[PDB]
Amino acid sequence: GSLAPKSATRNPVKLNNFCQIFKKSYEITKTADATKARTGSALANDKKRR
Amino acid sequence: GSLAPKSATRNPVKLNNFCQIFKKSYEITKTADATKARTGSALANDKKRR
Question: Does B30 touch chain A (CB under 8 A)?
Answer without folding.
Answer: no
